[PDB]
């Protein structure tokens, strides 16, 4: 059972789901057709937010975390 | 019980002792009472040196709660207090001009006001002389009389009641009844009098 | 670094408390951390806890952490 | 002397300079831009003074100046607006919703959503819906609030597909929106299929740039949160078997684009959560965590001495404190600390005082 593990694995997980689904959408939008997930996978952005949520899934809630999961998720929508 | 004698009683004003240099007498009083500093007691959980208050109304919320619910007391005091204030509001509203600009939208005069109008003036009393019963006018004290209508007034409010009444809006339709001299509270009161007139041939049975 | 530093303890009632009273900070009460409004519900220990800051005319200046 | 009651009803004028403005909004305006998320604790305000005044917020309006740029192209992004049980969290969607109604926006404004998870009474099954128990009392009363929600674009959306309603009835091509919802009301033992086939209808127009779907849901700790409605054995479903919440959880998944929906988290009713308890995920569970997508959170905090002074400016105008000793300098301090920075405190005691 992989729901009962040390640390939550990003791999294979409903958040990277629906980030993946996010992604699609915005490409399909921004007319682009050539979608490549291992070249997305590489960016700096969805690497801070899978260790945000990594980070909010193992410790418990503080400050720091949710702030730093707000950023990630400014700087990677492309949204003011 | 738990507490010794000699102890005076906590006090509540503030403003009075912020600058307590006007004359000399109560200097030397407070001189001498702050010397030997007695073990003055503690403050209940029920008095508050706030300015957003009032006894009246504190004692009153304190003969409200039945057992030990002081948080129910309180919230039925503030829904009492928030119906009146919604209805004086709306009545407000609901007028003209002459109407609205001869009276207030202050509910604690309101309360004393009736207050002042359910407190009864004589009382009677059951003096048994020679095997009977008879009602005796007697003389009473203005907190007598207070706690007396305040009572009344609660009693009134809770026995009489049917089944699709309610209680906030009740006593709040009861108050404002009482205001406007017209309620069953001073009905009580007027029998109460007219009752001890029609026996006012009985005051040489007292005895002080 | 404890400015406007003090201690204090108490019992009554069987209960114990240990207030940490600070001269500069806003008008908040935090009790075992978190604030005073999660902890005390009711306006009674409001008022209670509210009456010394209010017999000394010291409102907003004081912060504590009991 | 506290400015307030000068900056008319514009929600787009609302920037830095205009901190704390009671602006006045017109009696009409309410009953169309909000026709259902409406506390019950402050509608009693709103019929006493006869001016909706709300005011001006630093979280509240941060929250406009970043719909000044947002793409359409862009799926749907939420905005939580979490904080402490008190300062504003189920009344700080407002000044939001009213900002994008002016712009011609599609609102789906929901009332509650801890009203649709709780004290349920009746009971019915479906079978055009997966097999699953919603509630048809319920949908008789969101879809009458619905067409006065956004009356300039629920009459041009078209049906662009057939629906088999019942064995008497159906939907034809070329259907104004506005006729589908008033639809199945009249009949009320199909009436909780509605909420299914019309919410789905918009995902497909909102791509376009005539048309802006914005979900305006209060309070996202219902819909991932457990249950406590029993059947007729005495056992507690999961909120995964409710028709009438299915098909909405499938809306907040950015599955459409044309702006971003929002959300409001409240207190009335979060099951299972403590009271001291006050961050999104220790009130939503390990359900409202999972799905939640890339948001933008807003911690709604305290009150600064800044707005603490145009509140008691506001009704010493309107001659509100009925008080003698009251209005004296001392004694403005004592409010403060009654309240510790909270507007929902300050109205319980303002309420009679
Ligand atoms: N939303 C909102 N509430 C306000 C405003 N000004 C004062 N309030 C009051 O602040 C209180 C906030 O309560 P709220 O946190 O939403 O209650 P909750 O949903 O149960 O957590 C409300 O009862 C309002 O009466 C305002 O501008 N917006």
Not at chain 1, 17 to 23: G, H, M, V
Not at chain 1, 24 to 30: H, Y
Not at chain 2, 141 to 156: G, H, N, S, V
Not at chain 4, 29 to 50: A, I, W, Y
């Given at each position: 059972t992989e729901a009962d593990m040390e640390e939550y694995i990003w791999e294979n997980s409903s958040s990277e789901r629906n980030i993946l689904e996010t992604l699609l959408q915005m490409k399909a939008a921004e007319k682009n057709?050539?979608?490549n997930k291992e070249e997305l996978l590489g960016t700096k952005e969805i690497e801070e937010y899978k260790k945000s949520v990594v980070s909010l899934k193992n410790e418990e809630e503080n400050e720091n975390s949710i702030s730093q999961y707000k950023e990630s998720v400014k700087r990677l929508l492309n949204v003011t | 019980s738990r507490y010794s004698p000699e102890f005076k009683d906590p006090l509540i004003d503030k403003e009075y002792y912020?600058?307590?240099?006007?004359?000399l007498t109560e200097e030397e009083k407070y001189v001498r009472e702050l010397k030997?500093?007695?073990?003055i007691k503690a403050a209940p959980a029920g008095k508050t040196?706030?300015?957003?208050?009032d006894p009246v109304i504190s004692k009153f919320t304190n003969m409200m709660?039945?057992?030990?619910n002081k948080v129910l007391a309180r919230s039925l005091m503030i829904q009492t207090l928030e119906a009146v204030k919604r209805k004086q509001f709306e009545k407000y509203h609901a007028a003209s001009a002459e109407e609205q600009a001869t009276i207030?939208?202050?509910p604690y005069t309101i309360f004393h006001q009736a207050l002042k109008n359910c407190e009864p003036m004589i009382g009677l009393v059951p003096i048994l002389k020679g095997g009977r019963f008879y009602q005796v006018p007697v003389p009473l004290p203005d907190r007598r009389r207070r706690f007396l209508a305040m009572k009344w007034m609660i009693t009134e409010c809770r026995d009489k009641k049917h089944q699709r009444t309610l209680m906030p809006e009740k006593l709040s339709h009861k108050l404002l009844e009482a205001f406007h001299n017209q309620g069953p509270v001073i009905k009580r009161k007027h029998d109460l009098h007219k009752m001890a007139e029609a026996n006012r041939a009985l005051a040489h049975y007292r005895w002080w | 670094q404890g400015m406007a530093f003090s201690k204090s303890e108490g019992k009554r009632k069987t209960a114990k408390a240990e207030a940490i009273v600070y001269?500069?900070?806003?008008g908040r009460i935090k009790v075992n951390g978190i604030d005073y409004q999660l902890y005390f519900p009711i306006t009674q220990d409001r008022e209670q806890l509210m009456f010394p800051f209010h017999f000394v005319d010291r409102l907003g200046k004081h912060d504590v952490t009991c | 002397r506290a400015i307030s009651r000068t900056n008319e009803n514009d929600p787009a004028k609302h920037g830095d300079q205009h901190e704390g403005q009671h602006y006045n909004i017109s009696p009409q305006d309410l009953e169309t831009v909000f026709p259902?998320?409406?506390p019950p604790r402050f509608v009693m305000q709103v019929k006493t003074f006869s001016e909706a005044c709300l005011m001006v917020r630093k979280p509240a309006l941060e929250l406009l100046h970043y719909l000044?740029?947002?793409?359409?192209?862009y799926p749907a992004i939420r905005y939580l607006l979490y904080?402490?049980?008190?300062?504003?969290?189920?009344?700080?969607?407002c000044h939001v919703i009213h900002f994008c109604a002016k712009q011609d926006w599609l609102i789906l404004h929901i009332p509650d959503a801890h009203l649709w998870v709780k004290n349920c009474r009746d009971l019915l099954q479906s079978?055009?819906?997966?097999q699953r128990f919603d509630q048809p009392l319920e949908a008789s009363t969101w879809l009458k609030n619905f067409k006065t929600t956004?009356?300039?674009?629920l009459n041009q959306i078209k049906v662009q597909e057939k629906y088999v309603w019942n064995k008497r009835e159906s939907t034809e091509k070329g259907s104004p929106l506005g006729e589908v919802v008033e639809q199945?009301?009249?009949?009320?033992?199909?009436?909780?299929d509605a909420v299914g086939i019309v919410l789905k209808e918009l995902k497909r127009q909102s791509?376009?740039?005539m048309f802006h779907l914005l979900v305006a849901v209060?309070?996202?700790?219902?819909?991932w949160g457990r249950t406590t409605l029993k059947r007729e054995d005495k056992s507690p479903i999961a909120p995964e078997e409710l028709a009438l919440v299915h098909n909405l959880?499938?809306?907040?998944?950015?599955?459409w684009h044309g702006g971003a929906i929002v959300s409001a988290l409240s207190q009335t009713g979060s099951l299972?959560?403590?009271?001291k308890a006050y961050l999104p995920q220790e009130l939503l569970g390990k359900e409202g965590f999972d799905?939640?997508?890339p948001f933008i959170p807003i911690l709604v905090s305290n009150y600064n001495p800044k707005e603490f002074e145009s509140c008691i400016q506001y009704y010493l105008e309107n001659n509100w404190?009925?008080?003698?000793?009251?209005?004296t300098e001392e004694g403005k301090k004592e409010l403060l600390f009654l309240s510790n920075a909270n507007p929902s405190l300050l109205e319980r005691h303002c309420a009679y005082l």
């Amino acid at each position: 059972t992989e729901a009962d593990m040390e640390e939550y694995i990003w791999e294979n997980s409903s958040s990277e789901r629906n980030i993946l689904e996010t992604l699609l959408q915005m490409k399909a939008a921004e007319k682009n057709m050539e979608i490549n997930k291992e070249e997305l996978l590489g960016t700096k952005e969805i690497e801070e937010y899978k260790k945000s949520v990594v980070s909010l899934k193992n410790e418990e809630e503080n400050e720091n975390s949710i702030s730093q999961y707000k950023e990630s998720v400014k700087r990677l929508l492309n949204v003011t | 019980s738990r507490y010794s004698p000699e102890f005076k009683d906590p006090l509540i004003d503030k403003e009075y002792y912020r600058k307590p240099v006007e004359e000399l007498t109560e200097e030397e009083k407070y001189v001498r009472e702050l010397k030997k500093t007695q073990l003055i007691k503690a403050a209940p959980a029920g008095k508050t040196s706030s300015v957003f208050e009032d006894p009246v109304i504190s004692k009153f919320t304190n003969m409200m709660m039945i057992g030990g619910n002081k948080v129910l007391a309180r919230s039925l005091m503030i829904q009492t207090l928030e119906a009146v204030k919604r209805k004086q509001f709306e009545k407000y509203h609901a007028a003209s001009a002459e109407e609205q600009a001869t009276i207030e939208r202050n509910p604690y005069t309101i309360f004393h006001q009736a207050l002042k109008n359910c407190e009864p003036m004589i009382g009677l009393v059951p003096i048994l002389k020679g095997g009977r019963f008879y009602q005796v006018p007697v003389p009473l004290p203005d907190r007598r009389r207070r706690f007396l209508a305040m009572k009344w007034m609660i009693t009134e409010c809770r026995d009489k009641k049917h089944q699709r009444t309610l209680m906030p809006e009740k006593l709040s339709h009861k108050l404002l009844e009482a205001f406007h001299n017209q309620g069953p509270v001073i009905k009580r009161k007027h029998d109460l009098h007219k009752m001890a007139e029609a026996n006012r041939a009985l005051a040489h049975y007292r005895w002080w | 670094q404890g400015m406007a530093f003090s201690k204090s303890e108490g019992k009554r009632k069987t209960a114990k408390a240990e207030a940490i009273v600070y001269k500069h900070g806003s008008g908040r009460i935090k009790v075992n951390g978190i604030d005073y409004q999660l902890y005390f519900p009711i306006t009674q220990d409001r008022e209670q806890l509210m009456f010394p800051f209010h017999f000394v005319d010291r409102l907003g200046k004081h912060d504590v952490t009991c | 002397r506290a400015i307030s009651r000068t900056n008319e009803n514009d929600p787009a004028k609302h920037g830095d300079q205009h901190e704390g403005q009671h602006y006045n909004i017109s009696p009409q305006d309410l009953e169309t831009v909000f026709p259902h998320g409406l506390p019950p604790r402050f509608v009693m305000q709103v019929k006493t003074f006869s001016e909706a005044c709300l005011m001006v917020r630093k979280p509240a309006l941060e929250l406009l100046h970043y719909l000044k740029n947002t793409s359409f192209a862009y799926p749907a992004i939420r905005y939580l607006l979490y904080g402490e049980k008190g300062t504003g969290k189920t009344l700080s969607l407002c000044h939001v919703i009213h900002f994008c109604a002016k712009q011609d926006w599609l609102i789906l404004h929901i009332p509650d959503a801890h009203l649709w998870v709780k004290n349920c009474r009746d009971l019915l099954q479906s079978s055009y819906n997966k097999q699953r128990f919603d509630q048809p009392l319920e949908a008789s009363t969101w879809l009458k609030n619905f067409k006065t929600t956004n009356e300039r674009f629920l009459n041009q959306i078209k049906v662009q597909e057939k629906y088999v309603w019942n064995k008497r009835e159906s939907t034809e091509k070329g259907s104004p929106l506005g006729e589908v919802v008033e639809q199945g009301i009249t009949r009320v033992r199909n009436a909780t299929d509605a909420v299914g086939i019309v919410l789905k209808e918009l995902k497909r127009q909102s791509s376009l740039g005539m048309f802006h779907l914005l979900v305006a849901v209060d309070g996202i700790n219902a819909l991932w949160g457990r249950t406590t409605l029993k059947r007729e054995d005495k056992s507690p479903i999961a909120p995964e078997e409710l028709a009438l919440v299915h098909n909405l959880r499938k809306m907040m998944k950015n599955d459409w684009h044309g702006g971003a929906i929002v959300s409001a988290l409240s207190q009335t009713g979060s099951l299972f959560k403590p009271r001291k308890a006050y961050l999104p995920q220790e009130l939503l569970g390990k359900e409202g965590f999972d799905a939640l997508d890339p948001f933008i959170p807003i911690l709604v905090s305290n009150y600064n001495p800044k707005e603490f002074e145009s509140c008691i400016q506001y009704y010493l105008e309107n001659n509100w404190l009925q008080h003698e000793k009251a209005p004296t300098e001392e004694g403005k301090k004592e409010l403060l600390f009654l309240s510790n920075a909270n507007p929902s405190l300050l109205e319980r005691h303002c309420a009679y005082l």
